[PDB]
Amino acid sequence: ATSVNERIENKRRTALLGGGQRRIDAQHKRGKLTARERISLLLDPGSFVESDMFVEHRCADFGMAADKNKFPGDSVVTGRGRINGRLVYVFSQDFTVFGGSLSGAHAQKICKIMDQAITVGAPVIGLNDSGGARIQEGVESLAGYADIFLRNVTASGVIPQISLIMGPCAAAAVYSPALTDFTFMVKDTSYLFITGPDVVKSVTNEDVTQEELGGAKTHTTMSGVAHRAFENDVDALCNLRDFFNYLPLSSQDPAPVRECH
Amino acid sequence: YDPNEKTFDKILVANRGEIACRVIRTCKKMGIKTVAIHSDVDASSVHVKMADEAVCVGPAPTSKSYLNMDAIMEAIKKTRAQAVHPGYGFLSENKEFARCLAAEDVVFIGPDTHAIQAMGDKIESKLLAKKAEVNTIPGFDGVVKDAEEAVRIAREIGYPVMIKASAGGGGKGMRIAWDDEETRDGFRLSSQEAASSFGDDRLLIEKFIDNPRHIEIQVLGDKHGNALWLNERECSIQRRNQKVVEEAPSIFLDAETRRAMGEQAVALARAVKYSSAGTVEFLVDSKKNFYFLEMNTRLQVEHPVTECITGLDLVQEMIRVAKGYPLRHKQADIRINGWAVECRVYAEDPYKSFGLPSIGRLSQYQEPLHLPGVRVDSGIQPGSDISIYYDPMISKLITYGSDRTEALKRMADALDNYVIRGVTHNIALLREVIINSRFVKGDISTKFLSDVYPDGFKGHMLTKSEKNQLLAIASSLFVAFQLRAQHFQENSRMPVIKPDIANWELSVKLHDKVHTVVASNNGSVFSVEVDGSKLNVTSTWNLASPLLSVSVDGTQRTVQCLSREAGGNMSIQFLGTVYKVNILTRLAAELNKFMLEKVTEDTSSVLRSPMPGVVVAVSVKPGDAVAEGQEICVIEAMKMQNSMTAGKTGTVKSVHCQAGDTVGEGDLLVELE
Amino acid sequence: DPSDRLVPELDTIVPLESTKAYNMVDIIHSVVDEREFFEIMPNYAKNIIVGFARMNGRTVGIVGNQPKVASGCLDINSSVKGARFVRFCDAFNIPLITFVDVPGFLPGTAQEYGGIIRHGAKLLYAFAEATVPKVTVITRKAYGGAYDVMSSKHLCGDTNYAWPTAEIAVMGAKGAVEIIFKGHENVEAAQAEYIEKFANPFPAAVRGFVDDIIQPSSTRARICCDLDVLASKKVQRPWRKHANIPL
Numbered sequence A: 001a002t003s004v005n006e007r008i009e010n011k012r013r014t015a016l017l018g019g020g021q022r023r024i025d026a027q028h029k030r031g032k033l034t035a036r037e038r039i040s041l042l043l044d045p046g047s048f049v050e051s052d053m054f055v056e057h058r059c060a061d062f063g064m065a066a067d068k069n070k071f072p073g074d075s076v077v078t079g080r081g082r083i084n085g086r087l088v089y090v091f092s093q094d095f096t097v098f099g100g101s102l103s104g105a106h107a108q109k110i111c112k113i114m115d116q117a118i119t120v121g122a123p124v125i126g127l128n129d130s131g132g133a134r135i136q137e138g139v140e141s142l143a144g145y146a147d148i149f150l151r152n153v154t155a156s157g158v159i160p161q162i163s164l165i166m167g168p169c170a171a172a173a174v175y176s177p178a179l180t181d182f183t184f185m186v187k188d189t190s191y192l193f194i195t196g197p198d199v200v201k202s203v204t205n206e207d208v209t210q211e212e213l214g215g216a217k218t219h220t221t222m223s224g225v226a227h228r229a230f231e232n233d234v235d236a237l238c239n240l241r242d243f244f245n246y247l248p249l250s251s252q253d254p255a256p257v258r259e260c261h
Numbered sequence B: 001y002d003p004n005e006k007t008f009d010k011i012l013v014a015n016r017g018e019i020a021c022r023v024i025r026t027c028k029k030m031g032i033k034t035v036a037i038h039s040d041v042d043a044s045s046v047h048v049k050m051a052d053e054a055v056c057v058g059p060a061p062t063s064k065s066y067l068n069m070d071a072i073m074e075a076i077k078k079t080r081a082q083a084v085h086p087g088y089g090f091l092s093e094n095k096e097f098a099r100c101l102a103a104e105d106v107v108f109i110g111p112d113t114h115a116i117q118a119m120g121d122k123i124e125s126k127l128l129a130k131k132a133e134v135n136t137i138p139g140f141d142g143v144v145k146d147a148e149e150a151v152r153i154a155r156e157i158g159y160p161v162m163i164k165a166s167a168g169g170g171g172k173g174m175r176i177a178w179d180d181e182e183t184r185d186g187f188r189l190s191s192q193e194a195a196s197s198f199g200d201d202r203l204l205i206e207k208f209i210d211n212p213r214h215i216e217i218q219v220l221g222d223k224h225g226n227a228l229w230l231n232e233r234e235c236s237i238q239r240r241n242q243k244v245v246e247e248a249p250s251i252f253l254d255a256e257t258r259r260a261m262g263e264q265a266v267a268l269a270r271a272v273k274y275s276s277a278g279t280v281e282f283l284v285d286s287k288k289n290f291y292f293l294e295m296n297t298r299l300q301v302e303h304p305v306t307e308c309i310t311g312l313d314l315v316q317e318m319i320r321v322a323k324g325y326p327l328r329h330k331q332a333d334i335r336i337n338g339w340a341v342e343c344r345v346y347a348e349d350p351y352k353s354f355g356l357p358s359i360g361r362l363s364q365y366q367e368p369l370h371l372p373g374v375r376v377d378s379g380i381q382p383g384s385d386i387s388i389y390y391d392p393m394i395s396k397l398i399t400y401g402s403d404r405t406e407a408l409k410r411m412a413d414a415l416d417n418y419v420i421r422g423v424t425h426n427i428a429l430l431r432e433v434i435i436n437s438r439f440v441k442g443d444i445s446t447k448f449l450s451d452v453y454p455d456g457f458k459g460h461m462l463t464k465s466e467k468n469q470l471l472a473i474a475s476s477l478f479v480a481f482q483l484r485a486q487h488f489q490e491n492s493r494m495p496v497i498k499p500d501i502a503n504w505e506l507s508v509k510l511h512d513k514v515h516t517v518v519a520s521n522n523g524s525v526f527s528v529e530v531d532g533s534k535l536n537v538t539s540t541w542n543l544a545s546p547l548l549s550v551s552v553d554g555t556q557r558t559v560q561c562l563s564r565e566a567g568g569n570m571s572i573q574f575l576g577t578v579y580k581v582n583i584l585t586r587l588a589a590e591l592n593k594f595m596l597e598k599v600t601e602d603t604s605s606v607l608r609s610p611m612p613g614v615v616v617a618v619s620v621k622p623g624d625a626v627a628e629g630q631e632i633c634v635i636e637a638m639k640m641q642n643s644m645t646a647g648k649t650g651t652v653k654s655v656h657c658q659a660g661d662t663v664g665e666g667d668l669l670v671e672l673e
Numbered sequence C: 001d002p003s004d005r006l007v008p009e010l011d012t013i014v015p016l017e018s019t020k021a022y023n024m025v026d027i028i029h030s031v032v033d034e035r036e037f038f039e040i041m042p043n044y045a046k047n048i049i050v051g052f053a054r055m056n057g058r059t060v061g062i063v064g065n066q067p068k069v070a071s072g073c074l075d076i077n078s079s080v081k082g083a084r085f086v087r088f089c090d091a092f093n094i095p096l097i098t099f100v101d102v103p104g105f106l107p108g109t110a111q112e113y114g115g116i117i118r119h120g121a122k123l124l125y126a127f128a129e130a131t132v133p134k135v136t137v138i139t140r141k142a143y144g145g146a147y148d149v150m151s152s153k154h155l156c157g158d159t160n161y162a163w164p165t166a167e168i169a170v171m172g173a174k175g176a177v178e179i180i181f182k183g184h185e186n187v188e189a190a191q192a193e194y195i196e197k198f199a200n201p202f203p204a205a206v207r208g209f210v211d212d213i214i215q216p217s218s219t220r221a222r223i224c225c226d227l228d229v230l231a232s233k234k235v236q237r238p239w240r241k242h243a244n245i246p247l
């Protein structure tokens, strides 16, 4: 029996669906799109080329080797595309799969995309919706973060880097957006804090919720971390395309010139 | 050390410190497997590593770790311990402990219970000594109970009166009076303090011998009745009635008195049926009359020094006696072979009350073991922490020689070549004592520290020649550092032109005077000119070693550069004492004349807590004046205690940092006036 | 000063329980030549320590965490204090030595509103951009993203060591237990099995994130050897006018 083809198609349909229809319904009820919808809106129609669709995580601890804990893609969709004819590299984090927590494979995919971007000389756009670091993955997860960090520092001043926070972001998932040139957020749905409010109450003992501890208003008015805040996902992506039209593709290229009237 | 002789196979040491190391050493030499008990704090101590295996006893405090008989006995039972050595202190004289040992099967390396209880109580010890027809101090038999009885005793025995609380020891519960009113007030104070200190509340009037010499006779007894007196030792040098300097061959005492005291000690030991090792202390007046004072029923702390003259290992003899073998030596065999001197190195400041127990962690520790005729009994290794729960011991330094002068010279050299960095030690006090004219001549007593230093220890008073040598060495060290600072590696892009300065004109500010020094270099020899005097200083000038040896006009001196700063301050140890100097260039001094003094009174009226935590200790009270930089309160946070202080002399308006208060960071604690 | 001098006094300077603190300046003094240390900003942001010293006669820059002040947690002031010192040491070819004991970043609302993310990224960038030799020694805790910041091997670090008291983990064992085994709700042996395999430097060592688990007494000698091997280090980076540090 030629089960390889049906296995390939089942893996494709599982990756395209993230981690389940119920979780996608929960994501939509929160007012948030999925990673693939975000990429479809951001890029030109019929220009997305995806990389590492079938990559799976190698963790085999705490019952993470069971088939119910094997999601292809591993909570990140990476690839390349074009905006108004100009090449760009993109990664979007899927909150459906393990809350978007970064494991080894996640870091490998992001670093692979960033390495191609630094080799060719094209910008990187990253949509962050990670719930922190995958605890089951262990120190490996930490290592992955550092790898990404290094590449960011290596790509500073060589290619433009843009970050858009479209969901919660905590723990060490905050340094990479800070190392990029520009950071944008989505109002009422995006968060950015090193430490969660519960630990804040536990340690320094005051009542604060997520909204005024890491919300877009807080990080766009009184912290200076983010650069702009947009109404929702569609508006954010349209404004991101408009902004990307301005920048050059590499430090070697001169300032872009359009047609003037 | 006969391996054929089959003694016990396993021995448990029930003590901590250098004594545990001593017992482990002699057991490893003699072949016995050794198991060592340790608290949680001392889990990395020297004796734990030295022992074959170790068993933890429990919490840090001594009352809970080494004084817990149940833990000791379970440790013995688990490890199949055959014999036990208590050392000195802790359960050395514990009656119920030995009762439990005799109950199960356990042999005790030490005297029997009868001797322990006979010599434990001072009154019954004196009574037995009277029954032992040995010379005793003049006193009234019985326990004084009322002031009138005490003053009457003072009447018949004479105005010099000393009240001693029965039992206990360690220079406690003893008051000296000279008048009947002094007799009664000392009596009432002693009665009040006996319950707090000892609890026996039994008090004894005794006659105070004037300037006694505290001689001690080491005695070795076996189970077959053979008692031997192994020479003598002198421990006149005391502070707080505690021994510091200890001489094995007595110089004041002579052969006839030695024989008489040995015979008396042996007779009393036979009377007590003492079948182990111990010591008997005697007080000798100016007229060579010796009076009994206490018999130790344990291994004496200053045993090693006599081991240098007799040539015997006391602990090995104790083990053999505990086995049951008769003594292998006779009264004739023992001889006085040379001279031996011991100094007890404590971790205490000799500049305050002749030693105030300090704490700290040793960043550097090097013993002078390479010097000839030096023995170091220590339980200290680099990194060891001096705690508050234990006797602030550092080590015991012993020198042996042909005669007294050689031993004293070797002690001086060893003390000069001894490196302790991390706490405050009393090395300066020891070295200054051993070079005193009175000590060298031999006119010493129990008041040596008091009469020699009425104002207290002040350090070595250096003479004009010593001052010149110190200034020359300091200037030479300064110039050597400056010259070393110019030895960069070759750059080949911007070549370095080394300055060709020939003479250095420096101003050195020792104590308060200012001296003009002119120094020149001709390689390894510095020609120094201090206030007219001309000196030559030579050395290898190794600026990194802790100990630096320099020859000044032939005289060899070992010095340590404890501290050095770019501003000119230099703290250097010379002849035991740490001197602070300030060396500047001549132009630097001339310009510094313009700089105005900064008065350091500060205000610090509103003092704030460092970090949020509970205040364990409060050193101030409202209405009490403080000083500049005076300790205010000790606060613990994350069980880390910080002792935060004040900044200026001011009366405390109110203490908000009371004990137990969980004051937060930057909170008002004490207000100063 | 011999480059192979032993430092046994460091063998027990780290308390075995995790609640007491210790002075890392003591370790720095023990390691360096002649115990001479020129500290920079010694009274400001005292939870981090930076300074100049010498190893085998060669100038070295030293950065470390101070567990006495604020338990070693990183904050804005310490991050900006360390970042520029690291940048200056890199710019003028001065090797860097790091002593790592950090439980994480200091929490609170004031830190979040002050922009702790930007200032932490400053230090992360400063360590990642270094092209001079870098030696790192972990004395105890290295928890979370702080472990990434404090000169990790993953940031193109050269040589990393760990003392037998080191502990590299995403977080403390406790919170990791309540977060991983939340469903099991029975931790009496779960905590024991977690701390027996993760509350030690083995997870970091077996993945090669540290080159060796050295003894504290052999620190200085080891470092000296590295500084004689890494003196001729040269790396190449992509061309740029300048990089956009998160200033």
Ligand SMILES: CCC(=O)SCCNC(=O)CCNC(=O)[C@H](O)C(C)(C)COP(=O)(O)OP(=O)(O)OC[C@H]1O[C@@H](n2cnc3c(N)ncnc32)[C@H](O)[C@@H]1OP(=O)(O)O
Pocket (backbone or CB within 6 Å): A095, A096, A097, A098, A099, A100, A101, A130, A131, A132, A133, A134, A135, A136, A168, A169, A170, A171, A172, A196, C103, C104, C143, C144, C145, C170, C171, C172
């Ligand atoms: C001393 C050093 C340190 O402090 S280490 C800090 C690391 N500790 C963390 O918890 C990571 C930080 N993450 C978070 O705080 C929260 O996840 C935040 C970011 C607030 C997300 O908010 P929230 O929308 O309520 O998440 P959620 O409960 O709806 O999502 C549940 C799914 O996400 C997953 N998830 C979350 N965090 C982790 C994690 N650290 N490791 C592994 N998985 C994580 C949950 O497992 C859960 O999985 P699933 O997707 O439902 O299958």
Ligand SMILES: Nc1ncnc2c1ncn2[C@@H]1O[C@H](COP(=O)(O)OP(=O)(O)OP(=O)(O)O)[C@@H](O)[C@H]1O
Pocket (backbone or CB within 6 Å): B137, B162, B168, B169, B170, B171, B172, B174, B206, B207, B208, B209, B210, B212, B214, B238, B241, B281, B283, B293, B294, B446
């Ligand atoms: N009768 C006395 N005449 C003169 N001096 C005395 C007399 N009794 C005690 N002293 C002085 O007091 C010191 C302490 O003596 P003693 O050995 O009794 O003290 P202790 O604290 O009981 O000792 P230990 O720790 O050995 O039990 C002696 O060294 C001596 O200087």
Ligand SMILES: [Mg+2]
Pocket (backbone or CB within 6 Å): B169, B281, B294
């Ligand atoms: Mg006595």
